[PDB]
């Protein structure tokens, strides 16, 4: 099917891939913008701006994305009862486009606030694009390949991130005259989907259910699916949808006070809490602050940042390998327990630091270690495991518990770590040691083996926890 890989390319391009961007984008130029913060504050109010606020202000900068992940996601309930989801995403553009013409234009009008405000927009463009994208690919593809699309949406995250550092190098577009122009190309991205996207058929699924299209139904099947035998899938979907408009949603207050699932709840946030905590985004905001302070001498940090985020697209194609010959639960306490180990083994190098001109190299090697047990355990399984534990009709309800835990926790990890990183000096990854280690060890005791089970033996495993027998 050719329309099919238009549209999983496309789709992935201007929404999933720059929430990846976004991540990274931030860590080159990041010597010039505090340079900038500190002029535009002098050309202002005069006085110098003093070390704890020009940081704070920074992480400001940083994690101010997350909010509007977490403001981005709550809109979305708010379209999915006015809007499609191809239309959604085409509006959701509006937000990408508006935002890096905000950042982009923040030396030019000799304002910071502008960056603060363009980081907040774009937030909201990411975590709408989080939040459709997934739905999206589900309904126009068939059901033998959906297992294989949570990989593609999780992939271009990865592209992102490396595009992301690879456009910071000083030989394309990182230096201190040109360092606008790194979030102005958030815009070909935005511009390339809007173009390509509407031509495309609707999410079929949606306007059956919703605009009542049955005519126009089948001929967007067609194009997705390449058959012309399509009386099967279509009825499918009306099988579906009787069941789905029978249940009654549970709403978000309700699960948390619902002693029956107390402890699945509990589990889904623990787990997503450590899925940001466990520190990989602090390392995508700071790449060059913790190779700054890990002994190795300048010039050549933007290529060792660039190994970073090299690794992970290519563990990610191995991810789903490991996911499907090994199991679920013996990665989240491995994914976790490679964590706090090598955070260990991160710290021991920049404790040192000095006793060998070698030493300031492992601390490379430990950081990679991390990145590729993110991608092999804990990249995929949070958001797989919240749609598990929880039935049908507490399936929306578990995912907005997963959602809002998965924006402050990234928010936390972005405006604290500067600090702890002044005050800890070589310790700051010991904290995040601490957070993996807890998480390995919770979800050793808690966590029931998930793969190849029904819904009926995963709440009996936390029956025998929840003492809220049904």
Not at 185 to 191: Q, S
Not at 211 to 222: P, S, T, Y
Request: charged share 15%; glycine share 10%; proline share 5%.
């Amino acid at each position: 099917s050719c329309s099919l890989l238009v549209a999983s390319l496309a789709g992935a391009f201007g929404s999933s891939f720059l929430y990846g961007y976004n991540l990274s984008v931030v860590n080159a130029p990041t010597p010039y913008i505090k340079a900038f913060y500190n002029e535009s504050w002098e050309r202002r109010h005069g006085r110098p701006i003093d070390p704890d606020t020009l940081t704070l202000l920074w992480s400001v900068t940083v994690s101010i994305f997350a909010i509007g992940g977490l403001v981005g996601t709550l809109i979305v309930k708010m379209i999915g009862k006015v809007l499609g989801r191809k239309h959604t995403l085409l509006a959701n553009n509006g937000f990408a486009i508006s935002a890096a013409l905000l950042m982009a234009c923040s030396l030019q009008a000799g304002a910071f606030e502008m960056l603060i405000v363009g980081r907040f927009i774009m937030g909201i463009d990411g975590g709408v694009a989080l939040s459709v994208l997934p739905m999206y690919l589900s309904e126009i593809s068939p059901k033998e390949i959906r297992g294989s699309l949570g990989q593609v949406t999780a992939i271009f995250i990865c592209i992102g991130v490396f595009t992301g550092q690879l456009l910071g190098l000083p030989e394309l577009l990182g230096k201190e005259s040109t360092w606008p122009y790194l979030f102005g190309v958030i815009v070909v991205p935005a511009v390339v989907q809007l173009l390509s996207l509407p031509f495309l058929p609707d999410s079929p699924r949606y306007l059956l259910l919703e605009k009542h299209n049955e005519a126009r139904a089948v001929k967007a099947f067609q194009t997705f699916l390449g058959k012309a035998d399509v009386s099967q899938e279509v009825e499918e979907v009306l099988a579906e949808s009787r069941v789905q408009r029978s249940i009654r949603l549970v709403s978000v207050l309700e699960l948390l006070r619902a002693p029956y699932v107390r402890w699945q709840v509990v589990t889904v946030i623990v787990t997503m809490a450590c899925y940001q905590l466990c520190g990989l985004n602090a390392i995508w905001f700071y790449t060059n602050s913790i190779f700054g302070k890990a002994g190795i001498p300048p010039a050549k940090i933007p290529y060792v940042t660039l190994s970073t985020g090299g690794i992970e697209t290519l563990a990610a194609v191995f991810s789903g390998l490991v996911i499907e010959h090994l199991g679920r639960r013996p990665l989240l306490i491995g994914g976790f327990g490679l964590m706090g180990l090598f955070f260990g083994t991160l710290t021991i190098t920049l404790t040192l630091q000095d006793h060998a001109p070698w030493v300031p190299y492992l601390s490379i090697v430990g950081i990679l270690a991390i990145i590729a047990s993110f991608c092999s355990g804990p990249g995929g399984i949070p958001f797989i495991l919240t749609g598990e534990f929880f039935q049908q009709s507490q399936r929306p309800a578990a995912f907005i518990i997963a959602g809002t835990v998965n924006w402050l926790s990234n928010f936390a990890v972005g405006l604290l770590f500067p600090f702890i990183q002044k005050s800890l000096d070589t310790y700051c990854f010991l904290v995040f040691a601490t957070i993996c280690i807890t998480g390995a060890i919770y979800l050793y005791f808690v966590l029931p083996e998930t793969k190849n089970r029904t819904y009926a033996e995963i709440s009996q495993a936390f029956s025998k926890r929840n003492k809220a027998y049904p």
